[PDB]
TrEMBL record, chain A:
Disulfide bonds join 33-49, 107-113. This is Subtilase cytotoxin subunit B-like protein. Keywords: Signal. It comes from the Bacteria. Gene3D superfamilies: 2.40.50.110.
Length: 124, 118, 118, 118, 118
């Protein structure tokens, strides 16, 4: 399976966005975070962030930001791939999220979203 | 004829888009992939991808991504030029396809899209 | 708490924008500034600026400019994090402001904006 | 007069766009082409291209692409400045055009578009 | 006062735009120029331009171009800050003007625009 593509949430909408600058560990960083809803329902996995100079994948900051802004604007249905337990600074985690944003794919219907899905119920 | 312009599908619409970051073959990549429809017709050749650090043509990642995103927004008719059998990462190929996106042109009628047809 | 996130205003709207190039303190700079709406007044309050080559955070100039331009376009409610007493060029501070923009987050309701609170 | 500004078509609309990646003369290129209409009047001078690493002016690839995409979206009236007989790749010239795109200006009426005239 | 901010026109709209590539004084340049109106009337102070590799402030070419494009789209009321007597290529100044674009700020009423006044 595609490494780092095993945890996602499907058929959500990006309903909040944050962008900011922040000093961490002696490095000047940019970050953004997305907030999610599932139609009129609140979900448990509802926020995720990307940081330009930290994380498992530092590439693609601007392309990911522009993609997140696009879907916040359209309100379209998406699948968000994310990684747990990446941001470990507790004050950033409290303020924003611990999860790193990995990918954003579209859902053209209530039953199809683009991108890899887990093999089976146990992700063997 | 133009090398790598011999394989295309015309008058399709980009109806899905994926963008992500991913480690492939020991390298940090960005990729995007487009999903296609042709109205209500059943199509099998329906997904094409571009990767920033792999492929026959590594240039133009941002410009191709922004172009693909534009036509996803409009839903307009386009021609997709692509190359078969490029992606060798088995997990990536299974999730998307082996096809590399080469070019996107517009179609202004049922009978015309820009670019070569030979 | 997150350093530089202690001072903010919530559920505000950006009603004016400035972008320019300017020589300050012997350096060539770009800057932009946002003005915030107060009631029905035309004149903005609480202006905040970012400068490409000066400030506590020089990174993110283009992304912050594009974010500010976005919310000026939509008129949506946002929370703005900023730092007081940053710009020391007296002509610039008099013309625009002495505050430096740190972050912009959305407010999805009258009681919730993303980001940390005090 | 401004060199390379002597040949233009006025009050046209950009009604087609192409963007692709391509190996030409042994070098990796990006290119884009614009296709034109003139309302309902038949126009033969109807396609112009720009290439990132070839041409009389290599600068401004992304800005010219983004400008062309802008006018394709709006359908607004523009003047196109171009140079004939530029592209030496015969496969490219037959697929797209020989003409190099030099400038795009707007037209605010049927008689006025910005820029120099002959 | 802020150097280079003393000369401006207020409550204008950007009603034309030019973008092109051009060889000037032996250098390969990009430029753009803005055309203005003053509501229902013409204004004879016009055609302010920015050049990527010449001028008093060469930074911010892309951000100024994108900002100009934005106000051309919205038609919003703006103040333009500019510097007189900059461009010395006689063919360029005859086709456009000699004025270097310095800043664009918004106007929220018929009597207020952001930025300093004389
Ligand atoms: C996203 C992705 O699929 N990336 C994989 C890439 C791309 O498929 C490829 O670069 C596109 O052109 O392929 C990777 O594996 C290649 C690499 O191991 C080279 C090294 O020799 O071999 C390539 O296959 C060769 C083969 O070895 C030759 O003998 C002959 O058969 O031709 C083929 C041409 O493909 C591998 O594809 C890569 O690292 O480049 C792995 C990426 O994950
Ligand atoms: C370089 C320079 O002189 N800039 C001044 C400009 C120019 O003189 C003017 O734009 C050239 O046409 O004028 C500035 O003041 C004008 C501005 O406040 C506009 C706002 O709409 O009003 C102009 O007054 C109008 C007036 O309100 C009308 O009733 C009528 O009387 O005509 C005049 C002309 O339009 C003000 O002159 C400017 O900011 O544009 C001041 C600049 O310093
Ligand atoms: C677009 C344009 O007009 N470019 C001019 C350029 C600009 O006018 C100038 O750099 C902006 O400050 O001026 C050029 O020519 C001259 C210089 O060679 C010389 O150093 O000084 C001259 C004035 O006394 C004049 O500016 C230039 O910088 O090369 C010519 C160029 O086409
Ligand atoms: C736009 C502006 O005000 N720039 C001024 C900066 C900023 O105030 C600080 O860089 C903020 O951290 O301060 C200076 O003293 C400096 O650093 O040399 C002078 C300069 O003119």
């Amino acid at each position: 399976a595609m490494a780092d593509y095993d945890t996602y949430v499907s058929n959500v909408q990006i309903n909040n966005l944050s962008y900011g600058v922040y000093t961490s560990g002696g490095k000047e960083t940019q970050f953004f975070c997305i907030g999610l809803k599932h139609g009129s329902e609140a979900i448990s996995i509802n926020a995720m962030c990307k940081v330009d100079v930290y994380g498992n994948h530092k590439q693609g900051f601007d392309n990911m930001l522009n993609t997140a802004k696009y879907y916040y604007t359209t309100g379209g249905d998406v699948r968000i791939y994310y990684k747990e337990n990446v941001w470990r600074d507790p004050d950033f985690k409290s303020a924003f999220s611990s999860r790193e944003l990995i990918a954003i794919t579209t859902c053209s219907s209530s039953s199809y979203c683009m991108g890899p899905t887990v093999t089976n119920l146990e992700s063997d």
